[PDB]
């Protein structure tokens, strides 16, 4: 379910970037993804090395 | 807090105008902290250089 919310949010921001923005066709990518949901929540910590 | 105690243990003042932040987990491997932009503007406001 919670994934569903992030998916729809990515979509609706694509929609506002279609309706009047400067984008004719959005295509989400990992580098620009930061703009669409902001800072990551979880991390890949690996709290220690050895 | 750690560096505080250590300064006190030897009586040496910490080098002046040094701000820091982080987390420590009983072996010294520092861990990420969040919200960094706000702490950054505050440190710039206080004149701390490091």
From Swiss-Prot, chain B:
Effect annotated for changing residue 21 to V: Enhances the basal, but not the stimulated ATPase activity
**Family designation:** Belongs to the peptidase S16 family.
- First and last residue shown, out of the full length, are 860 to 909 of 959
Q: In which tissues is it expressed?
A: Duodenum, heart, lung and liver, but not thymus.
Task: Give the source's domain of life in one word.
Answer: Eukaryota
Name its cellular compartments. Answer: Mitochondrion matrix
Q: How does it assemble?
A: Homohexamer. Organized in a ring with a central cavity. The ATP-binding and proteolytic domains (AP-domain) form a hexameric chamber, while the N-terminal domain is arranged as a trimer of dimers. DNA and RNA binding is stimulated by substrate and inhibited by ATP binding. Interacts with TWNK and mitochondrial DNA polymerase subunit POLG.
State the encoding gene.
LONP1
Protein name per the record: Lon protease homolog, mitochondrial
UniProt comment concerning the protein's domains: The Lon N-terminal domains are crucial for the overall structure of the protein, maintaining it in a conformation allowing its proper functioning.
**Natural source organism:** Homo sapiens
């Amino acid at each position: 379910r919670n994934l569903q919310k992030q998916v729809e949010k990515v979509l609706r921001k694509s929609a506002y970037k279609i309706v009047s923005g400067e984008a004719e066709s959005v295509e989400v990518t990992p580098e620009n993804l930061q703009d669409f949901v902001g800072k990551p929540v979880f991390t890949v910590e690996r709290m220690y090395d050895v | 807090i750690v560096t505080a105690l250590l300064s006190l243990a030897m009586g040496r003042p910490v080098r002046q105008n040094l701000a820091m932040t982080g987390e420590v987990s009983l072996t010294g491997k520092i861990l990420p902290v969040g919200g960094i932009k706000e702490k950054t503007i505050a440190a710039k406001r206080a004149g701390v250089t490091c």
